[PDB]
Design an enzyme around this catalytic site. Structure first.
Site, PDB file in Angstrom:
ATOM      1  N   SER A 121      32.016   0.962 -38.743  1.00 26.80           N
ATOM      2  CA  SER A 121      32.936   0.349 -37.776  1.00 26.80           C
ATOM      3  C   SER A 121      32.324  -0.965 -37.301  1.00 26.80           C
ATOM      4  CB  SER A 121      33.243   1.404 -36.700  1.00 26.80           C
ATOM      5  OG  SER A 121      33.483   0.849 -35.424  1.00 26.80           O
TER       6      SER A 121
ATOM      7  N   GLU B 137      42.008   5.784 -41.606  1.00 26.26           N
ATOM      8  CA  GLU B 137      41.280   5.035 -40.585  1.00 26.26           C
ATOM      9  C   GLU B 137      42.077   4.906 -39.290  1.00 26.26           C
ATOM     10  OE1 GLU B 137      38.202   4.127 -40.898  1.00 26.26           O
ATOM     11  OE2 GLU B 137      37.734   3.519 -42.955  1.00 26.26           O
TER      12      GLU B 137
ATOM     13  N   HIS C  93      38.557   7.925 -39.241  1.00 24.94           N
ATOM     14  CA  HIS C  93      37.560   6.895 -38.958  1.00 24.94           C
ATOM     15  C   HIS C  93      36.267   7.539 -38.473  1.00 24.94           C
ATOM     16  CE1 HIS C  93      36.436   2.754 -38.020  1.00 24.94           C
ATOM     17  NE2 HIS C  93      36.300   3.006 -36.726  1.00 24.94           N
TER      18      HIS C  93
HETATM   19  C1  LIG Z   1      36.601   2.981 -30.951  1.00 20.15           C
HETATM   20  C2  LIG Z   1      35.407   2.688 -31.830  1.00 20.15           C
HETATM   21  C3  LIG Z   1      34.575   3.786 -32.001  1.00 20.15           C
HETATM   22  C4  LIG Z   1      34.098   3.961 -33.297  1.00 20.15           C
HETATM   23  C5  LIG Z   1      33.203   4.981 -33.616  1.00 20.15           C
HETATM   24  C6  LIG Z   1      33.945   6.193 -34.141  1.00 20.15           C
HETATM   25  C7  LIG Z   1      34.618   6.892 -33.111  1.00 20.15           C
HETATM   26  C8  LIG Z   1      34.310   6.757 -31.760  1.00 20.15           C
HETATM   27  C9  LIG Z   1      35.038   7.522 -30.843  1.00 20.15           C
HETATM   28  N1  LIG Z   1      34.783   7.400 -29.535  1.00 20.15           N
HETATM   29  C10 LIG Z   1      36.042   8.402 -31.251  1.00 20.15           C
HETATM   30  C11 LIG Z   1      36.791   9.181 -30.358  1.00 20.15           C
HETATM   31  C12 LIG Z   1      37.772  10.047 -30.845  1.00 20.15           C
HETATM   32  C13 LIG Z   1      38.010  10.130 -32.224  1.00 20.15           C
HETATM   33 CL1  LIG Z   1      39.299  11.172 -32.910  1.00 20.15          CL
HETATM   34  C14 LIG Z   1      37.257   9.358 -33.101  1.00 20.15           C
HETATM   35  C15 LIG Z   1      36.281   8.494 -32.613  1.00 20.15           C
HETATM   36  N2  LIG Z   1      35.561   7.761 -33.483  1.00 20.15           N
HETATM   37  C16 LIG Z   1      35.856   7.888 -34.900  1.00 20.15           C
HETATM   38  C17 LIG Z   1      33.343   5.846 -31.315  1.00 20.15           C
HETATM   39  C18 LIG Z   1      34.104   4.558 -30.886  1.00 20.15           C
HETATM   40  C19 LIG Z   1      32.381   5.439 -32.402  1.00 20.15           C
END
Ligand SMILES: CCC1=C[C@@H]2Cc3c(c(N)c4ccc(Cl)cc4[n+]3C)[C@H](C1)C2
Ligand SMILES: CCC1=C[C@@H]2Cc3c(c(N)c4ccc(Cl)cc4[n+]3C)[C@H](C1)C2
Ligand SMILES: *[C@@H]1O[C@H](CO)[C@@H](O)[C@H](O)[C@H]1NC(C)=O
Ligand SMILES: *[C@@H]1O[C@H](CO)[C@@H](O)[C@H](O)[C@H]1NC(C)=O
Ligand SMILES: *[C@@H]1O[C@H](CO)[C@@H](O)[C@H](O)[C@H]1NC(C)=O
Ligand SMILES: *[C@@H]1O[C@H](CO)[C@@H](O)[C@H](O)[C@H]1NC(C)=O
Ligand SMILES: *[C@@H]1O[C@H](CO)[C@@H](O)[C@H](O)[C@H]1NC(C)=O
Ligand SMILES: *[C@@H]1O[C@H](CO)[C@@H](O)[C@H](O)[C@H]1NC(C)=O
Ligand SMILES: [Cl-]
Ligand SMILES: [Cl-]
Ligand SMILES: [Cl-]
Ligand SMILES: [Cl-]
Lengths: 532, 532
Positions: free
Chosen positions: B197, B324, B437
């Protein structure tokens, strides 16, 4: 007696013609207008003055003056569309096939030929009305109308060359049918007009035009609609093309009267020889002299008339063919050939898109290209060829017709929509061209019923089905016979948008004819072009 | 001895940690920067001043100040991303996992966490380096960097808040690794940076930035690339967002000095509480304080640098996940829910499109809609849901990365591209979200090797495969072991554009990852938006 009819303008003597194992009556070359010759070139038609004695109606009339296709000399597939009679500006005649014995008061169908508003003849073998009149017990009329500059040179504001006079030729033949068909056993209150390509657009234009609406009952439109991008021009564009025609012929351009006087001195072939030179773009499926949005034949823009319901409210039956574009690509686009599968390079694909959407800016061309390109397989010559085929057909025929279908059905009294996708077993054109523009006509006119033409028995049945749909719709406003047990052709409705395939297989009902591409052609691309 | 290491900034004492059935050395919370506190908030990092005595590196450091997600309090699937340590501006530390016994000069991998440049921690359970370091015998570093306004407030022209200081934090940690990792058995000439990311975008940004290029050997990018629409802003937009942050906090806005001085006197949480207020539009997958195209860290526009080959020429391995977009839709778009299938109405679809492409005019919104709508079936809530999912992932991750991949490969020394599409058997998120993602990270870090976490045996095999690809690529520039009989992951080339799926099935090679949609996102739509 059966062949001797007294009309409001004089006596006519028809002829007894063989049809299959029987016979019917034919009245060929009846005049409905004064010859539009000399000082009457470009003018609105005038009713034919009554004659004494008996008009010999045993012989096809002359054809109107037009471009003659010489691309494939002697080839039946192209020659079948060329004039088969002498060409003459003295060409405003109609033909009538009447069942024998003469019926009392039967349904009338009036055929309006197509040909891009630059060509067409009532006398083609494929428009022979005798099979339809005989098989379905209808009175079949085919009219004629001036084409090219002779019918559509438009100097708006001049009463000498006002424009739309070819449409007024059609209307005057409709007026003649209204006034006289009762003497041939036809009911003037049950007249269906039908036509293909420019004839289909014409049918829609008579639906729109207030001066035409009371001269027919209902309408059939085949591969054409009034809103097609090739089917009309503005008064400014018509005026530009008329001035440019004079420029090509060294005409005085200072005034309408001087320009018109110059053009009336030219021989017909002199006009035809330069006809294509007035088009504003290199293009395909574009024609020089077409109806003009004049404020008279068309009180306002076609779209506003369609939006407001300013049109004749009746029943319509209409549709398209699977591969409307192939004819035009063969004749006008790089990489296509009558004698090869015509696999299209990427370079020739891009050239074809530009020819097909000549009015589009570079962004619009990109949109069309993206919409029709498989970028996992962009060098596939078959996909590029078929993509171009779909572009031409969707943009020029299918999507304009679907816009018309959807607008008309909001106010009309019955819509039946078809998709004709049968390729004839005996087609002389190559396989890549598929189900070609205009090749439903031979089924509508019953040519598969003729043994010597070598259609299959399944194609005879299809032609019989189509003729019965057409004639039953003409009689009743509904292609289906009641209390019949065959499957029913459903009304096209705003909500469900049903149509049927027309082919040799049992009837299938579908919904939303080419809806994905027509959202692109009817909403997104116009918005893109308007915004950029 | 094994745990006592003298670095150029002073001595550190690590801890011996269990890993599976063995042990490795861990050095947790080593400082690499002076605490960026007080008058050093928003400032470039300064190197950590050397210390006397022994730094106790047995404990994770603080996490940087950031927004904390409270949408699903106590839910493991969201809590696993939140800070698991105390938040403090005193947060510029790194962690090192070292195989035991210490190797002599082995491959180094430096993890850069993601989180939209507004969040992220090096200490998350899912970033635990011990499985990768032990299994693949690499030295595994995880760095940290300031996020949100603290790392990316940008008032170009000011030296007190210049912008990009979070990227400089990352660079300073890379400089520390360059200077010190040899003392832990790592080869400073064989450092791979990898991140997901915003971490993946960061990795690409160090490839681009001349000041970073010499501090690493090669690079891995997971679901992020430097050209992503969310990953940078212009100097003008960065300035506007900074001024708007001061406006939200009753700050003197007369000058940079006064604005900065006001912002430096606020408690960290006061900044975070208004962070999202400075975005220009209601949106998803947009973040307030991100890298700025400044003319220094980035000498020119990212696109010009990509076009000219103005970047580090080495090997890269990179890829995306199948779904994603679902995380961002769940959290920000109407109709999505953690506890339902989230079938999306047409109305909510159109709302989601505008949230997903907030910068687009109405014509651009129409283009996106038409491209992702099945007009034969436009009320299909599942198709609408998955269409939105694709819009979000294609626009924000997949197609930006495919643009980067194609530009990079023209000049680079070896590209390997993957498509991760395995849904974990033990996922706590609902099925509609698919392959989310960030949910490849747990496979990269070897969590499926922990029996208690209840992955399948096939998922353990997939994790081991992925770790070995990543580490073999880190060691050699090629994820494949030569002389081996495993199926080979092919180079991505400009011509053939091959990639592999990463999942539990035998390897499949494909070409042109999502090429159709990415022509739309990368070529057509930008051109539409520039015209209008
Ligand atoms: C928003 C950017 C982010 C990317 C990375 C992946 C990530 C994060 C989250 N807090 C998430 C919160 C809920 C869900 Cl379902 C997926 C998330 N994911 C996939 C953090 C924040 C690290
Ligand atoms: C150009 C308009 C036009 C429409 C009608 C259909 C039509 C005509 C042709 N001369 C054609 C010549 C070759 C081929 Cl393959 C198809 C044709 N077709 C299908 C004339 C002219 C009548
Ligand atoms: C009508 O014309 C045809 C051929 O032109 C001719 O055979 C026929 O006798 C004519 N009828 C007359 C002259 O009454
Ligand atoms: C046609 O018009 C008649 C008379 O108003 C009406 O009863 C009928 O429902 C209409 N049919 C269609 C298909 O619109
Ligand atoms: C139709 O078939 C007949 C009989 O087989 C044949 O003699 C004739 O040539 C065919 N006609 C055409 C136009 O091909
Ligand atoms: C370092 O910190 C750990 C964790 O609290 C502790 O167990 C250890 O005793 C500390 N070492 C020294 C030398 O104080
Ligand atoms: C990488 O660079 C080396 C050294 O110049 C060259 O020999 C090799 O062909 C390159 N490999 C790729 C995949 O570009
Ligand atoms: C793993 O699965 C077993 C058996 O299904 C179960 O008893 C255990 O609680 C699971 N572990 C977790 C962390 O849910
Ligand atoms: Cl006479
Ligand atoms: Cl075909
Ligand atoms: Cl309806
Ligand atoms: Cl899914």
């Amino acid at each position: 007696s059966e062949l001797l009819v007294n009309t409001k303008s004089g006596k006519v003597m028809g002829t007894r013609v063989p049809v299959l194992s029987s016979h019917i009556s034919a009245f060929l070359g009846i005049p409905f207008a004064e010859p539009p010759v000399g000082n009457m070139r470009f003018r609105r038609p005038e009713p034919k003055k009554p004659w004494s004695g008996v008009w010999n109606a045993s012989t096809y009339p002359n054809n109107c003056q037009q471009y003659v296709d010489e691309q494939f000399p002697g080839f039946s597939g192209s020659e079948m569309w060329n004039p088969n009679r002498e060409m003459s500006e003295d060409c405003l005649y109609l033909n009538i096939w009447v069942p024998s014995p003469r019926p009392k008061s039967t349904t009338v169908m009036v055929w309006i030929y197509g040909g891009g508003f630059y060509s067409g003849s009532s006398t083609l073998d494929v428009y022979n009305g005798k099979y339809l009149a005989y098989t379905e017990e209808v009175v079949l009329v085919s009219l004629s109308y001036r084409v090219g500059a002779f019918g559509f040179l438009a100097l708006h504001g001049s009463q000498e060359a006002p424009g739309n006079v070819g449409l007024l030729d059609q209307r005057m033949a409709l007026q003649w049918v209204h006034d006289n068909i009762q003497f041939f056993g036809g009911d003037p209150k049950t007249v269906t007009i039908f036509g293909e390509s420019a004839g289909g657009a014409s049918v829609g234009m008579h639906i729109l035009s207030p001066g035409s609406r009371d001269l027919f009952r209902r309408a059939i439109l085949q591969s054409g609609s009034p809103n097609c991008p090739w089917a009309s021009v503005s008064v400014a564009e018509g005026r530009r093309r008329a001035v440019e025609l004079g420029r090509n012929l060294n005409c005085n351009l200072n005034s309408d009267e001087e320009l018109i006087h110059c053009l009336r001195e030219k021989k017909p072939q002199e006009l035809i020889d330069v006809e294509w030179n007035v088009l504003p773009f290199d293009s395909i499926f574009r024609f020089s002299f077409v109806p003009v949005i004049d404020g008279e034949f068309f009180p306002t823009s076609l779209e506003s008339m369609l939006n407001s319901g300013n049109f004749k409210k009746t029943q319509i039956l209409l549709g398209v063919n699977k591969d409307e574009g192939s004819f035009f690509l063969l004749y006008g686009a790089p990489g296509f050939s009558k004698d090869s599968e015509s696999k299209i390079s990427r370079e020739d694909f891009m050239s074809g898109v530009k020819l097909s959407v000549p009015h589009a800016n570079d962004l619009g061309l990109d949109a069309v290209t993206l919409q029709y390109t498989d970028w996992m397989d962009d060098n596939n010559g078959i996909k590029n060829r078929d993509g171009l085929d779909d572009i031409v057909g969707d943009h020029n025929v299918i999507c304009p017709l679907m816009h018309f279908v959807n607008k008309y059905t909001k106010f009309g009294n019955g819509t039946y929509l078809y998709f004709f996708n049968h390729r004839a077993s005996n087609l002389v054109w190559p396989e890549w061209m598929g189900v070609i523009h205009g090749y439903e006509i031979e089924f509508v006119f019953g040519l598969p019923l003729v043994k010597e033409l070598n259609y299959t028995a399944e194609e005879e049945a299809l032609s019989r089905r189509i003729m019965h749909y057409w004639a039953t719709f003409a009689k009743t406003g509904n292609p289906n016979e009641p209390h019949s047990q065959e499957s029913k052709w459903p009304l096209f409705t705003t909500k469900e948008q049903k149509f049927i395939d027309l082919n040799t297989e049992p009837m299938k009902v579908h919904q939303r004819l080419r809806v994905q591409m027509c959202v692109f052609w009817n909403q997104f691309l116009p918005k893109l072009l308007n915004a950029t």
